[PDB]
Amino acid sequence: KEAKYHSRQVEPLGKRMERNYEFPQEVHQDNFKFGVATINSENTAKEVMFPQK
Amino acid sequence: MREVISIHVGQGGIQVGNACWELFCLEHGIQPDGQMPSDDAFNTFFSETGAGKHVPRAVFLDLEPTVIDEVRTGTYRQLFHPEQLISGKEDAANNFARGHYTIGKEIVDLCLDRIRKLADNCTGLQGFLVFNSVGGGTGSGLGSLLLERLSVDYGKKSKLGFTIYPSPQVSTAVVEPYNSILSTHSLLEHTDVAVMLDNEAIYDICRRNLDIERPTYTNLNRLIAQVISSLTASLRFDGALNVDITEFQTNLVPYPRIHFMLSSYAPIISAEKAYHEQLSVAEITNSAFEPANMMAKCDPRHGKYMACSMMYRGDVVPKDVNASIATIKTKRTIQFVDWCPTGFKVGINYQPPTVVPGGDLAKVMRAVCMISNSTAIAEVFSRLDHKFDLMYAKRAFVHWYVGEGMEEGEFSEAREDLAALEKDYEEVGIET
Amino acid sequence: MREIVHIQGGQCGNQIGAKFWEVISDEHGIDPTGTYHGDSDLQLERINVYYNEATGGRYVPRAILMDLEPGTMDSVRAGPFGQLFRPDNFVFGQTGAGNNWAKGHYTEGAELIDSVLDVVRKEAEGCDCLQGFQITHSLGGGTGSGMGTLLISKVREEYPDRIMETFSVVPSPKVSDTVVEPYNATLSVHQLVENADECMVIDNEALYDICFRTLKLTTPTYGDLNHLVSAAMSGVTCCLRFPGQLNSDLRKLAVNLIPFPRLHFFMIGFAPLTSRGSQQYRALTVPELTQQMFDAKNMMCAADPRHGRYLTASALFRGRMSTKEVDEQMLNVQNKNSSYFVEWIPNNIKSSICDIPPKGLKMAVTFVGNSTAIQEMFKRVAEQFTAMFRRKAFLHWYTGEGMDEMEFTEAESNMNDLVSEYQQYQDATA
Amino acid sequence: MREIVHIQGGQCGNQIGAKFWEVISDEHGIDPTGTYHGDSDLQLERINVYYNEATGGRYVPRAILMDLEPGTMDSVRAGPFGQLFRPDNFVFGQTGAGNNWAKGHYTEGAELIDSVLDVVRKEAEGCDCLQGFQITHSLGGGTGSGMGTLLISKVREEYPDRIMETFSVVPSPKVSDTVVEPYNATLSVHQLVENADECMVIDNEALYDICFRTLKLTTPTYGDLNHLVSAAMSGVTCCLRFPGQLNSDLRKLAVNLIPFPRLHFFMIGFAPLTSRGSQQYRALTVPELTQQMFDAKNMMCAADPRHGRYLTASALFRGRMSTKEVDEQMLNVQNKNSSYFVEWIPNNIKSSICDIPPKGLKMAVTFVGNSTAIQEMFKRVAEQFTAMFRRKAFLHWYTGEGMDEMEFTEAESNMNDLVSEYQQYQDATA
Amino acid sequence: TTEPEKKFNSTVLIGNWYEERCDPNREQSKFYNERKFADNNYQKYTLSENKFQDTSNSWLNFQENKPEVKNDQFITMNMQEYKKPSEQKRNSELKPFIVKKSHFDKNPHELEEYREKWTKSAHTFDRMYLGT
Ligand SMILES: Nc1nc2c(ncn2[C@@H]2O[C@H](COP(=O)(O)OP(=O)(O)OP(=O)(O)O)[C@@H](O)[C@H]2O)c(=O)[nH]1
Ligand SMILES: Nc1nc2c(ncn2[C@@H]2O[C@H](COP(=O)(O)OP(=O)(O)O)[C@@H](O)[C@H]2O)c(=O)[nH]1
Ligand SMILES: Nc1nc2c(ncn2[C@@H]2O[C@H](COP(=O)(O)OP(=O)(O)O)[C@@H](O)[C@H]2O)c(=O)[nH]1
Ligand SMILES: [Mg+2]
Numbered sequence A: 001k002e003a004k005y006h007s008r009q010v011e012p013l014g015k016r017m018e019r020n021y022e023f024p025q026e027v028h029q030d031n032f033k034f035g036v037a038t039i040n041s042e043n044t045a046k047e048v049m050f051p052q053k
Numbered sequence B: 001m002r003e004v005i006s007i008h009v010g011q012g013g014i015q016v017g018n019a020c021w022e023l024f025c026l027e028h029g030i031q032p033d034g035q036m037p038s039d040d041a042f043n044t045f046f047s048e049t050g051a052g053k054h055v056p057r058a059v060f061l062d063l064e065p066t067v068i069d070e071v072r073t074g075t076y077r078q079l080f081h082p083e084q085l086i087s088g089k090e091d092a093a094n095n096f097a098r099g100h101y102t103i104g105k106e107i108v109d110l111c112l113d114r115i116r117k118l119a120d121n122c123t124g125l126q127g128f129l130v131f132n133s134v135g136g137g138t139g140s141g142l143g144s145l146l147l148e149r150l151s152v153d154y155g156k157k158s159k160l161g162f163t164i165y166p167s168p169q170v171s172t173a174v175v176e177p178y179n180s181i182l183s184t185h186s187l188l189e190h191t192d193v194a195v196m197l198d199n200e201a202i203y204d205i206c207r208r209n210l211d212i213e214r215p216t217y218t219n220l221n222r223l224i225a226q227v228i229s230s231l232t233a234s235l236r237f238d239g240a241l242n243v244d245i246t247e248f249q250t251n252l253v254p255y256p257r258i259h260f261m262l263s264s265y266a267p268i269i270s271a272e273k274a275y276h277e278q279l280s281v282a283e284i285t286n287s288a289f290e291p292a293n294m295m296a297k298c299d300p301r302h303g304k305y306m307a308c309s310m311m312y313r314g315d316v317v318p319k320d321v322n323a324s325i326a327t328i329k330t331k332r333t334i335q336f337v338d339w340c341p342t343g344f345k346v347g348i349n350y351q352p353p354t355v356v357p358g359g360d361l362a363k364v365m366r367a368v369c370m371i372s373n374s375t376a377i378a379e380v381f382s383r384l385d386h387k388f389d390l391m392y393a394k395r396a397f398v399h400w401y402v403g404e405g406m407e408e409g410e411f412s413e414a415r416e417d418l419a420a421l422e423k424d425y426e427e428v429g430i431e432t
Numbered sequence C, D: 001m002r003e004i005v006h007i008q009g010g011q012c013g014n015q016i017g018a019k020f021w022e023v024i025s026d027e028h029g030i031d032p033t034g035t036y037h038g039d040s041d042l043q044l045e046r047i048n049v050y051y052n053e054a055t056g057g058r059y060v061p062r063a064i065l066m067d068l069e070p071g072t073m074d075s076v077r078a079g080p081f082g083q084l085f086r087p088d089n090f091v092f093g094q095t096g097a098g099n100n101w102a103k104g105h106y107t108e109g110a111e112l113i114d115s116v117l118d119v120v121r122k123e124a125e126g127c128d129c130l131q132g133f134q135i136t137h138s139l140g141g142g143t144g145s146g147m148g149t150l151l152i153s154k155v156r157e158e159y160p161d162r163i164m165e166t167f168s169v170v171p172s173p174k175v176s177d178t179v180v181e182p183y184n185a186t187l188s189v190h191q192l193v194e195n196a197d198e199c200m201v202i203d204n205e206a207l208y209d210i211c212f213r214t215l216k217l218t219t220p221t222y223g224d225l226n227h228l229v230s231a232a233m234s235g236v237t238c239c240l241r242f243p244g245q246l247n248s249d250l251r252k253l254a255v256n257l258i259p260f261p262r263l264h265f266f267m268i269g270f271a272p273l274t275s276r277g278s279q280q281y282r283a284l285t286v287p288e289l290t291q292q293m294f295d296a297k298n299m300m301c302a303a304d305p306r307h308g309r310y311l312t313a314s315a316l317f318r319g320r321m322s323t324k325e326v327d328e329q330m331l332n333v334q335n336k337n338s339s340y341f342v343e344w345i346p347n348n349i350k351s352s353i354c355d356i357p358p359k360g361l362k363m364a365v366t367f368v369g370n371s372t373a374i375q376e377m378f379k380r381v382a383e384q385f386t387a388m389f390r391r392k393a394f395l396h397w398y399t400g401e402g403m404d405e406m407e408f409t410e411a412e413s414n415m416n417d418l419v420s421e422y423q424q425y426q427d428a429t430a
Numbered sequence E: 001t002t003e004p005e006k007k008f009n010s011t012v013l014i015g016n017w018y019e020e021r022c023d024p025n026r027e028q029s030k031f032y033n034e035r036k037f038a039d040n041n042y043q044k045y046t047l048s049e050n051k052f053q054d055t056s057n058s059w060l061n062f063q064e065n066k067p068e069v070k071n072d073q074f075i076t077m078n079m080q081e082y083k084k085p086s087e088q089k090r091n092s093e094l095k096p097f098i099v100k101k102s103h104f105d106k107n108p109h110e111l112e113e114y115r116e117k118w119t120k121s122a123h124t125f126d127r128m129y130l131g132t
Helices: B010-028 B065-073 B096-102 B104-119 B137-153 B176-188 B199-210 B217-236 B246-252 B281-289 B318-330 B375-392 B398-402 B410-428 C010-028 C071-078 C101-107 C109-126 C142-158 C181-195 C204-215 C222-241 C250-257 C286-293 C323-336 C372-389 C405-424 D010-028 D071-078 D101-126 D143-158 D181-190 D204-215 D222-241 D250-257 D286-293 D323-336 D372-389 D395-399 D405-423 E018-022 E067-072 E077-081 E109-113
Strands: B003-009 B046-048 B054-056 B058-062 B085-087 B125-133 B158-164 B193-196 B260-266 B305-313 B344-349 B367-374 C003-009 C051-053 C059-061 C063-067 C130-138 C163-169 C198-202 C265-271 C310-318 C349-354 C364-371 D003-009 D051-053 D059-061 D063-067 D090-092 D130-138 D163-170 D198-203 D265-271 D310-318 D349-354 D364-371
Touching: B003 B010, B003 B104, B003 B137, B010 B058, B010 B065, B010 B125, B010 B137, B010 B217, B058 B065, B058 B104, B058 B137, B065 B085, B085 B104, B096 B104, B096 B137, B096 B176, B104 B137, B125 B137, B137 B158, B137 B176, B158 B246, B176 B375, B176 B410, B193 B246, B199 B217, B217 B260, B217 B305, B217 B344, B217 B367, B246 B305, B246 B344, B246 B367, B260 B281, B281 B305, B281 B318, B281 B367, B318 B344, B367 B375, B375 B410, C003 C010, C003 C109, C003 C142, C010 C063, C010 C071, C010 C130, C010 C142, C010 C163, C010 C222, C063 C071, C063 C109, C063 C142, C101 C109, C101 C142, C101 C181, C109 C142, C130 C142, C130 C250, C142 C163, C142 C181, C163 C181, C163 C250, C181 C372, C181 C405, C198 C204, C198 C250, C204 C222, C222 C250, C222 C265, C222 C310, C222 C349, C222 C364, C250 C310, C250 C349, C250 C364, C265 C286, C265 C372, C286 C310, C286 C323, C286 C364, C323 C349, C364 C372, C372 C405, D003 D010, D003 D101, D003 D143, D010 D063, D010 D071, D010 D130, D010 D143, D010 D163, D010 D222, D063 D071, D063 D101, D063 D143, D071 D090, D090 D101, D101 D143, D101 D181, D101 D395, D130 D143, D130 D222, D130 D250, D143 D163, D143 D181, D163 D250, D181 D372, D181 D405, D198 D204, D198 D250, D198 D372, D204 D222, D222 D250, D222 D265, D222 D310, D222 D349, D222 D364, D250 D310, D250 D349, D250 D364, D265 D286, D286 D310, D286 D323, D286 D364, D310 D323, D323 D349, D364 D372, D372 D405, D395 D405
Parallel strands: B003 B058, B003 B125, B058 B085, B125 B158, B158 B193, B193 B260, B305 B344, C003 C063, C003 C130, C130 C163, C163 C198, C198 C265, C310 C349, D003 D063, D003 D130, D063 D090, D130 D163, D163 D198, D198 D265, D310 D349
Antiparallel strands: B046 B054, B260 B367, B305 B367, C051 C059, C265 C364, C310 C364, D051 D059, D265 D364, D310 D364
């Protein structure tokens, strides 16, 4: 009953301040881990020479 | 085959070692009982008991029983070896002479016995890590005595000191400048590498980046543990460019006296506002050098840079590292010492950071931990010298020290040593 | 026959060799299990140049992996093609050198080198008649730069008539990863110049430039760099292992590239190199192979070849072609760029032809050039060295393991003299 | 099957035997009802060594319980595992000895020993090939120290060829329990040097300090001390009962540890001993076992073994391990402690290996040592005896049964001769 | 600063408490989670037992509770090593570095995809020798 003081959902006891966002739960819940991207590795690296074709 | 021994003294060191040991155990997947559920990287920190669990290579020392007993009764009761948790009976009570002349002399023998019984099992000892808050009597005294004993008992083995100097204005005790300056004199000629960890900087980082306005000690300990893991991960995780403990002092120490470095870590963002951005390598390495993110309350813009060693962990690429370092060199606000054309050392590791459930930190691929030797560090020594001088002008609190057996004239020697140290810094900092 | 052994040290050298042996095995049709599975008879025709036989008919390379830290071999043994190497040949210390030249050359290297020298002696007496030694190492690392060159001295003092080959990866200031490259680099090259019969230099920044510009792939890797360097390795000796119009060995190159005994530092290059998307637009011809082989941007070094004059050049062609096109176009390129070729040595370009091209390609070219442009590398390295040394920075750690500043003074004086001597002939006129 | 019979008298001997038989039954899987319920077949080939077979498939120990008072046997029969002993092997008087050696060795012992001699003879020809006798008793008491030693004399007269070992609980000066120890202590110790082939000393003070320092248990009782002694004595004859790589019996130990007929006093020790907190936290290896077994404070005797030099030592490893490590451990401990070993005899440490570790462990070590530091206990006892005898205190109680001071003087003289002759080898140089 | 004799029941921090807390015969060994480990009263309304360490009842023969010990405690070298030449395998413990078990030994499928992946793939050996 004191939860809604505008001082609880802010500056809580050693915890995250409740910036209440809503993430897309269809993804993003199991093992997603931030970052810009997977730094997409260039297709073909070591067979550009000796093309094997 | 490669191992390092960890020493904790003073309740601050104990409480930060606790945080280090949740993090290492969770990183290696070991449950609190010490058993592994289901290669041999753990050999860096742990040792097989012969059948089943693993035991850490750590020792805890204190003259006050409460913290050690809380450790013995906490959730990690079944992990630590029972007779390496050395506890005394009566606390030093912020008196450096108490912890260095009367009470610590009785416990140093047991500590040395345990250190020997740990080192004989080890075969490829990399070195020692030591944790101790500086402003406390028992911490300073036992750190000094242990370091002095070890330097003559073992000789040339590397030793790393993770010291927490007092904040510029924020303070807890009222006499901690005295024991801080004394312990600094003691460890100046005994420690190969000492790092700065004044707490007010961590409070600022937690307030700004983590956005927690009332942080508790656990968060600070968690950050320090993350930094330790970042430093050490190269020994127990494969990487494209690995660096050992011995590959720190060979590249960070221009002169034998100058071995105090300050560290920074990045990225520090909560999971709440990290999903919204990308955190590329260039911006994380810029934030690493950004002055307010240094966990030492010193302004790097007020002095020159001497040497920078940075560890990248995750999926970083050497071309990206070179592209970032070129921009850092191009930037004008940061200038290096004249007689070092190149001053960067770079390490790269694959295993991305781990996150503790219920913690504040967030789980990314790319992380950077930077350790810098710079000429700007003289400010903290000057301000502590001033605080010492104001108190020592009228011999305040001197009786509490002189009645414990420590000689009156010892303070003058430490004062002269500090003056010599700042003289050496200002002499090195000039260009040719 | 005219057989040559492989030894390697330092992590950079081990990474280079771990892919060079892959290239050799792929060319000769040898599986990672050591059993031949090729199709042609010429594949086993000169397998002796690099391989030994064991009971049961399996092949083993004669390479000796040697250093102070076991982690890199712990990695490479689990890696691809790590099963070929003889498990006895691995020799590693338990301390590591910590990128300190003193620790890698005086206190740990001298102690450890007895076993590796013994195994080298055994492998040397094993062959019917040795041709020479070839080395892969990096000059920026402590254990490599020190222990490798000490081993070179020890091998030279016993085998004064054989050939010495070194592939040295020198530190360029553009991509710097350590703080102490100049010291150990100059210390290593001091001893290297007196004993090595041939040394050619490679640059990581130059390799990055090649990978960005010619192949145009967005994410280069150490594997890619090692592979192209290994192709350069193979192209030198392919003529020694396969028949051709004009067979030319290591001693051929030695007599034909070195006018004076102290000028044995080279820069190399490989052609063709094309991007994946443009590989079908190019129509493989000797003319374009030559124009690419002489491109300045295609060199594997930071040295700019048009900043100086070529003392001599050599080309190794692989594949089937007429000799008339090759030598006529060699004359053409010599005439059109006569300003960049020294005048008192007429006809200063070697041509050699081998009838077996590399895998998957019809024609290939390997270029080795001795020119005066390489002085810039030593100039910048010496500048860094003197900047660090004038203040005695990082010096007491080198001094604490038996050396003094007199050695460093001698090294810098010798290298400055070397640079002056190397540039002397550039302005020499007939 | 080279069996041995067991004899015990006095309260201490009865308690030690009660715990020893419990330990042996636990090792061999025997119920308190005497029914076998083991798992492996290795528990039955040598079950006849300690147990005779009765009707119904049950087993009975071949032990003799002897005393001057009925309370001791009334307690042991009521205690656990009291159903193993047959009622016939109990033998007791009705008067008691009262710590009076004369009463237990001249008046009551002489008239009572006929029955015990009869029963021990019956048990002796019960077995096919007797191996020897083992006795457990205390010298500081009356009935044990008198009647048991007189029985020792009689049995040695009857069987000169068999071997007799004794486990003697001597009075320790620190833990003083009775006021008339030195008299009967000297009187007993005289009568062992002529008969006992092996004697092993045990001290209650040493047991207490072991429990307080190594075990760190707050409230030890006599049960734990008995358990320690039972384990230590059981580890002696493991090789005789179980297969192993190097079998060794009591005769081997005697020949291998006795340089001269009058030096048959030993101090024993057991390993590994650790507290309850550190049960899982330390590793069981041959180096750790051999490091602990040679600790000065781990011995079962109050004497400090680092004040003298060993003549011979013997170790009986149990479990499965490598023999090279064992032998190298003895060689290392012999080289690092050359000052604590007599020099004119080389290789004075014996090794034995049995493949069956005790229940609840995986390796164990029993150590038996003959060293010149054992004489301190005899010197202290001699001092007490002389000081108490110069005033003829308590002497009339002994003289009241035809006992004379002439043989008191002879006993103390012979014991002093023992001390002198046994310590003169400490400084003997070849 | 020396050891004190027993003064208080095991449950306090007077000297030498840990051992008798580890001892299982004492009723103190086995404590409750709501005893300490408690943020607030309303969170939990039923106890749970946690037990103090994992120690056997008898100080000696302390390697009990390990199922492997009973299994391997009655084996000797002869039965261990001389079983039968038909189904005998080597039990010696070689040097760690010699048994690294490289990647292709770890997974064989890579091995047979390789070869026709990159071995014997499009070699063109043309020799201009007039006799050949
Ligand atoms: N960052 C951090 N600092 C701590 C911690 N604990 C104590 N400190 C600092 O240490 C200073 C005093 O030293 P303490 O560690 O508390 O105690 P001590 O050094 O062992 O000396 P004593 O008080 O005599 O026991 C305080 O001013 C704190 O700022 C901790 O857990 N984390
Ligand atoms: N070609 C190649 N060079 C590498 C690789 N890894 C590191 N290097 C080079 O090795 C140099 C550092 O050498 P270092 O490790 O100190 O030599 P060490 O002391 O003998 O181990 C760097 O300048 C890199 O350019 C690789 O995988 N391939
Ligand atoms: N270790 C041990 N010592 C005992 C035990 N019972 C008695 N003693 C020792 O034996 C001594 C007394 O022996 P005593 O009973 O008079 O021998 P007795 O007269 O022959 O029966 C005391 O000093 C005790 O220390 C026991 O159960 N265990
Ligand atoms: Mg405290």
